Design a protein around this nucleic acid. Structure first.
Ligand code: HPA
Ligand code: HPA
Lengths: 338, 338
DNA sequence: AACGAAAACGTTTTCGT
DNA sequence: AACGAAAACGTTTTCGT
């Protein structure tokens, strides 16, 4: 088809290619004539052919977990903005935490020859770290670890522990001493790490968390629902709760209401993530905000770098969570006494 | 690199290619030897080369509006499941309703030579219908129109009007006669069409909607927020409200609460979409459900068809909305009298 | 029986002059 | 000055025998 264009125009394909890519000077007349043809012939230059030669697809592949979850979804929309602006094409793939599913997309990706790879897998067992490393040659960044699990990749780090700590500290300073917590999955950073950040503040204050007050969640609203319930469904209940993710908080909130308990009036609740629409939770949710957009833009960037400036050394950038006060928390019993 | 494999194995690339694609019989011995090499050499067959020849990329491109919005996001996660299972690669692109942005991704897409194109643009002006048709040769389906706007594409249709109608009819039959409505954008099917489905039921019942009771939204929680407010912020207010989308409902709900009005006790509210987590709205939201997943799987399918069975004739499939009763609606003044 | 040799797919790019 | 001819990128596939 470039051949076809060359001929309607009566110049060499070499010519046509030069004008289409402004890669060498071409007389106006010639240049026009080309476009002329380019047009009527209705030509779409082939990226496949092109990549075949120049050696890069100008496309990036996101090997994610899932994409419906608010959290994830916001991150993804961000990464996409960035590919778009720097000319990349996004290939989105959800592995749902399945090794097989993962071994597959990974390979499909390599085969399609993505210029780099963004990794958001949530949980990383040895088996997965292992496949990951077989692709060390394709440049890549992990957007969701706490520390840097490997040497063959870039890492953007969230400081999830200091998020955890901030959350607890707020409750503490608000008068609270009987706190419960519904962490998310311990096999995830945003799961374990937020918890532990919360747990230090507790020890620090000599607050002890009765095991019957800690109930695992899985980031989904339903998990929050059941965990709330189980908490408030007992003789002795805390006055405040730290919930590992906004969406689950949202479920925690529904149950409180269902049991006719008032928030924050009967139970205070603090979440985490600061999802796009936690302000419209009822009540407006007080939570820890995760820089979602910078987590994304920051990831795209270390990758480009590696890609463009051909970097070989691993790198890591920290990002920082911060408290957003809204209306789901009220002073606790000890406020006045400090 | 296939050449490299051929040689470690001492067979022809032709051979290697036959075993890698099981496209002709190869002796075990030979077959093994190949894999052998395939392995140590650590070979990843090139899809780019391959597509270059066989003529198809085995990849589909989603030219969407945005992907953070619950609604959209759920649809997308669906389409992705389907590509994955039928071997396709997904290229996600958000045009945010911008013509330019649209003219771009469209072209980037063609150039990358996607096997087909899924279209979800929300609004379709002539200018966009126009670009769309310049790509009539790349097979495509529009997942969001009400009727079939063109002849050069497939259409999956939602019956949004009969969704609108169902919603109104519920309110009516619950005792309600003073209803307000916050529709979404009239330039969108899910905007206009839901409204009109609602508006017929009204006329049908001789209920009239005071213009001061209809306030445009844009599907975002904030728009619901402002529109609620404006409704309840006036001398005479309705007792029930029909809100064009769940997320905006969610915002409508927050404001009611903020003005200290009770739902459903003070105002009844019915939404639309049945987003994944409307059940955890507070109160659990009564709404019209949109088959999201079938809207997706149904789209992927007409496309495959066109792609695989090489279809030329346009086609359209209807899908059907349905009421989900939860807890945001209560009987109105006229319940007993019917 | 089981496999090779060689052209082609649609570009980009080196050297020409 | 302004442009062409021809090889190459990494596969698949037709005909061989
Ligand atoms: O794994 C996760 N899933 C969903 N939301 C989240 N927010 C933090 N981590 C997660
Ligand atoms: O355009 C839309 N955006 C978001 N949610 C929606 N639900 C129906 N239509 C829409």
């Amino acid at each position: 088809t470039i051949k076809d264009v060359a001929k309607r125009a009566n110049v060499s394909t070499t010519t046509v290619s030069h004008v289409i890519n402004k890669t060498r000077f071409v007389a106006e007349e010639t240049r026009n004539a080309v476009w002329a043809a380019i047009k009527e012939l209705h030509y779409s230059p082939s990226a496949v052919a092109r990549s075949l030669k120049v050696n890069h697809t100008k496309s990036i592949g996101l090997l994610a977990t899932s994409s419906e979850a608010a959290y994830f979804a916001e991150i993804i929309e961000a990464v996409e903005k960035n590919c778009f602006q720097k000319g990349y094409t996004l290939i989105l793939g959800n592995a749902w935490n399945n090794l097989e599913k993962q071994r597959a997309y990974l390979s499909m990706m390599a085969q399609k020859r993505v210029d780099g790879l963004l990794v958001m897998c949530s949980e990383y067992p040895e088996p997965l770290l292992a496949m990951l490393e077989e692709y060390r040659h394709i440049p890549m960044v992990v957007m969701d670890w706490g520390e840097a699990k490997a040497d063959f990749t870039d890492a953007v780090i969230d400081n999830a522990f200091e998020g955890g700590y901030m959350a607890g500290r707020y409750l503490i300073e608000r008068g609270h001493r009987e706190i419960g917590v519904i962490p998310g999955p311990l096999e995830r950073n945003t799961g374990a790490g937020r918890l532990a950040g919360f747990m230090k503040a507790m020890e620090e204050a000599m607050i002890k968390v009765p095991e019957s007050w800690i109930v695992q969640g899985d980031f989904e609203p339903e998990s929050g629902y059941r965990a709330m319930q189980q908490i408030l469904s007992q003789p002795h209940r805390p006055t405040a709760v730290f919930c590992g993710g906004d969406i689950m908080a949202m479920g925690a909130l529904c149950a409180a209401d269902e049991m006719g308990l008032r928030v924050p009036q009967d139970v205070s609740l603090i979440g985490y993530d600061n999802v796009r629409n936690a302000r419209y939770f009822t009540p407006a949710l007080t939570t820890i905000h995760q820089p979602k957009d910078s987590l994304g833009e920051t990831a795209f960037n270390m990758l480009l770098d590696r890609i463009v400036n051909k970097r070989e050394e691993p790198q890591s950038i920290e990002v920082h969570p911060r408290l957003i006060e809204r209306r789901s928390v009220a002073d606790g019993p000890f406020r006045d006494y400090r």
